[PDB]
Amino acid sequence: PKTLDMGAILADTSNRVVVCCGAGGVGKTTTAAALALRAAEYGRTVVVLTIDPAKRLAQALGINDLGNTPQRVPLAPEVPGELHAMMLDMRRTFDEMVMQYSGPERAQSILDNQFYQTVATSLAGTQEYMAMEKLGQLLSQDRWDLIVVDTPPSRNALDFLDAPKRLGSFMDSRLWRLLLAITGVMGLAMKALSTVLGSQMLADAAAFVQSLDAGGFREKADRTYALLKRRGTQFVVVSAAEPDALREASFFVDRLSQESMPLAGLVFNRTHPMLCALPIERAIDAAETLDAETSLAAAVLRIHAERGQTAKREIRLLSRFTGANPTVPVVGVPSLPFDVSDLEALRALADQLTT
Amino acid sequence: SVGWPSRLSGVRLHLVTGKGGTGKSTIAAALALTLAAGGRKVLLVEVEGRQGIAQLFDVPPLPYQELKIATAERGGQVNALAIDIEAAFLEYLDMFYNLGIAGRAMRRIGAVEFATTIAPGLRDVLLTGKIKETVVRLDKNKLPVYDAIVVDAPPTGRIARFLDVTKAVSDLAKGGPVHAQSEGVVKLLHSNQTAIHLVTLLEALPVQETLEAIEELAQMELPIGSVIVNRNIPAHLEPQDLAKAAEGEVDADSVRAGLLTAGVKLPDADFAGLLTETIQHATRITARAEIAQQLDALQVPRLELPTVSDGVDLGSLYELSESLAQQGVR
Numbered sequence: 265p266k267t268l269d270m271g272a273i274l275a276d277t278s279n280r281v282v283v284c285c286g287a288g289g290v291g292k293t294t295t296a297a298a299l300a301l302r303a304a305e306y307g308r309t310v311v312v313l314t315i316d317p318a319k320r321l322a323q324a325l326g327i328n329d330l331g332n333t334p335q336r337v338p339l340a341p342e343v344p345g346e347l348h349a350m351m352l353d354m355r356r357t358f359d360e361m362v363m364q365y366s367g368p369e370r371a372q373s374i375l376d377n378q379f380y381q382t383v384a385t386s387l388a389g390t391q392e393y394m395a396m397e398k399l400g401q402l403l404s405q406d407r408w409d410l411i412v413v414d415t416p417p418s419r420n421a422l423d424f425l426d427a428p429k430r431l432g433s434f435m436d437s438r439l440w441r442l443l444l445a446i447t448g449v450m451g452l453a454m455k456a457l458s459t460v461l462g463s464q465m466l467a468d469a470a471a472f473v474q475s476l477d478a479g480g481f482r483e484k485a486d487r488t489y490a491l492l493k494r495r496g497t498q499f500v501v502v503s504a505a506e507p508d509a510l511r512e513a514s515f516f517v518d519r520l521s522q523e524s525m526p527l528a529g530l531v532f533n534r535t536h537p538m539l540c541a542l543p544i545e546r547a548i549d550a551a552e553t554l555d556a557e558t559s560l561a562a563a564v565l566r567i568h569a570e571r572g573q574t575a576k577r578e579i580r581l582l583s584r585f586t587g588a589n590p591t592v593p594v595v596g597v598p599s600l601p602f603d604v605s606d607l608e609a610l611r612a613l614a615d616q617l618t619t
Numbered sequence: 620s621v622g623w624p625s626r627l628s629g630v631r632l633h634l635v636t637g638k639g640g641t642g643k644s645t646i647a648a649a650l651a652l653t654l655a656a657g658g659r660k661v662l663l664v665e666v667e668g669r670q671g672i673a674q675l676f677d678v679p680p681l682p683y684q685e686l687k688i689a690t691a692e693r694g695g696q697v698n699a700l701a702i703d704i705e706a707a708f709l710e711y712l713d714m715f716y717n718l719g720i721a722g723r724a725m726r727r728i729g730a731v732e733f734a735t736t737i738a739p740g741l742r743d744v745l746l747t748g749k750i751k752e753t754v755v756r757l758d759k760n761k762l763p764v765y766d767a768i769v770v771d772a773p774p775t776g777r778i779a780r781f782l783d784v785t786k787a788v789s790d791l792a793k794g795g796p797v798h799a800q801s802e803g804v805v806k807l808l809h810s811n812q813t814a815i816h817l818v819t820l821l822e823a824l825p826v827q828e829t830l831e832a833i834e835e836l837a838q839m840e841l842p843i844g845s846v847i848v849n850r851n852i853p854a855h856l857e858p859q860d861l862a863k864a865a866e867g868e869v870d871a872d873s874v875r876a877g878l879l880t881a882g883v884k885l886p887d888a889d890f891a892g893l894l895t896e897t898i899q900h901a902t903r904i905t906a907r908a909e910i911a912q913q914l915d916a917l918q919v920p921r922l923e924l925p926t927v928s929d930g931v932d933l934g935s936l937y938e939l940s941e942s943l944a945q946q947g948v949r
């Protein structure tokens with residue numbers, strides 16, 4: 265194997281952006297939070313851009329609000345650094361982007377359009393695109409020496425890297441102006457849409473295209489995506505013990521390799537290290553003998569053999585990933601016996617990641 | 620207390636929802652197998668273009684045709700329909716507006732993709748309309764083509780809007796035939812022909828969304844079917860012992876005695892590790908039971924499926940179908 269050393273990465277202030285990538289549901293958000301907290305405890309001025317924090321986690325951080333903007337997290341006075349946090353508001357980041365490029369006056373029209381409000385702001389990939397936008401804003405205001413980026417959940421970890429350019433290309437389709445705001449073919453398509461779709465809706469849509477007055481969206485997605493290639497960017501891929509999460513991690517590491525983008529390593533989350541050395545087979549047999557003859561001793565034996573089997577599966581999964589990627593550093597994080605919903609649990613998690 | 624009231628046996632349309640990653644696709648497939656046993660014919664439908672059925676069965680992407688994908692017990696048959704929204708849109712233009720020519724022109728420039736993407740409501744009309752068409756289709760003898768239709772449905776955060784036919788039709792051209800068929804779709808969804816099952820895991824968010832989805836769907840007067848708790852694990856401890864272990868109390872002298880009996884003596888570090896191993900197990904079971912308790916609020920049938928220890932393969936689908944069958948699903 266290899267040992268990922270998140271501690272040295274976090275402590276080194278030439279690393280300005282840390283992106284937590286992986287499937288959804290593998291521990292990205294809590295991992296991002298543990299990393300941002302530990303970086304503050306190392307003395308850095310950190311902001312964590314969380315996407316979907318658990319209600320309780322967001323409260324431990326004081327960001328259970330609707331703001332679309334970072335707030336200081338109160339930590340113990342001894343702490344040399346500063347932890348600030350926010351939760352991406354997809355719709356509000358869309359509003360800010362629209363105003364930034366159309367201006368506040370035109371923005372009142374765009375923001376009032378019911379097609380913008382009900383369709384445009386919930387298209388596929390809006391969440392990745394606005395995460396990248398918000399990241400752009402954070403970089404430009406130079407309000408922090410460290411930005412830790414949670415990334416939105418998806419069954420597909422590469423969505424973070426691919427959905428934004430994809431959505432941009434959709435927004436720049438010729439079909440917007442031609443079909444909503446003549447030719448034999450385009451005239452056919454236009455007729456079809458007019459005959460199938462509601463008049464109110466087509467009016468709102470053509471209004472939206474007119475007002476926005478944008479290849480604008482793809483160009484934005486490209487510029488913002490290049491930020492991920494500035495010196496000082498680190499990706500951390502997080503995966504659970506499961507085969508699916510690991511496979512998404514592998515896909516993602518592959519893409520990072522092809523693009524020569526810095527991969528810090530893999531966080532292999534939710535493991536079950538053995539605390540007792542009793543072999544599995546022994547464990548089973550011993551319990552079966554007791555089964556033939558105080559239930560408690562047999563049950564403890566079955567707990568332990570079950571855990572042992574799970575550990576075997578985990579070890580062989582990681583061995584697969586390490587075989588395919590012998591160059592990728594790893595840190596294994598055991599499943600902790602409590603929920604990660606308070607600054608104290610964040611501290612125990614960060615202890616697991618940093619060592 | 621039963622997981623499958625007899626009324627669910629007369630349901631013709633089963634919609635399987637649940638939060639992402641809880642196993643909608645797996646369970647919708649096992650449910651289809653369960654209802655297909657005994658020489659019946661059931662259609663398994665997915666609606667999101669995700670080719671999840673083909674992925675589940677480890678086969679290449681399925682085309683827009685109903686095709687036999689699995690044999691059920693005693694000669695039953697499960698067909699698969701990965702609904703293709705673009706083809707469904709073309710079908711719609713030709714059948715209801717005789718605009719097949721325009722439609723085939725749109726396919727050439729990517730315009731059907733555009734129209735389905737831009738209008739969310741049209742999309743849901745097409746999908747729900749196709750579902751209704753498969754539910755009500757009759758053969759040469761005026762008999763139903765399918766004994767049941769099982770839909771791998773959109774997830775809990777979208778299922779209520781997905782089934783919101785009135786809102787879907789709101790953004791379509793007024794008059795014409797679409798509004799005629801939409802009344803029929805709403806009737807089907809609100810009848811005793813339909814049921815929505817919600818898959819959940821014993822984790823906080825899947826349960827929270829299960830509860831919220833059940834609430835939203837009851838306000839719409841859509842029929843709830845079962846909550847299906849997926850990937851259960853064995854407690855291995857009796858309730859009193861469990862409760863004690865979740866607090867750190869294990870009464871080791873008893874454990875040392877049991878081990879001594881079993882011909883095994885452990886060093887003290889190993890014994891301490893074994894004690895820690897069962898406390899953590901008990902903390903996990905206790906947390907799961909606490910989450911589970913939140914479902915007790917609903918007067919909804921509850922089904923339970925085990926964890927398949929390795930990756931879900933075809934034999935696993937049959938194992939899960941057997942568990943449903945043993946719980947009364949039929």
Ligand SMILES: Nc1ncnc2c1ncn2[C@@H]1O[C@H](COP(=O)(O)OP(=O)(O)NP(=O)(O)O)[C@@H](O)[C@H]1O
Pocket residue numbers: 419508637638639640641642643644645646671774849850924925926927928929930931
């Ligand atoms: N009882 C079970 N035991 C073990 N693994 C399971 C079980 N049920 C499902 N799985 C696995 O759980 C993962 C998620 O299941 P899946 O059936 O894909 O869920 P889903 O609800 O379809 N999620 P999505 O389609 O992403 O919204 C898959 O990798 C399955 O193979």
Ligand SMILES: [Mg+2]
Pocket residue numbers: 643644671771
């Ligand atoms: Mg699925």
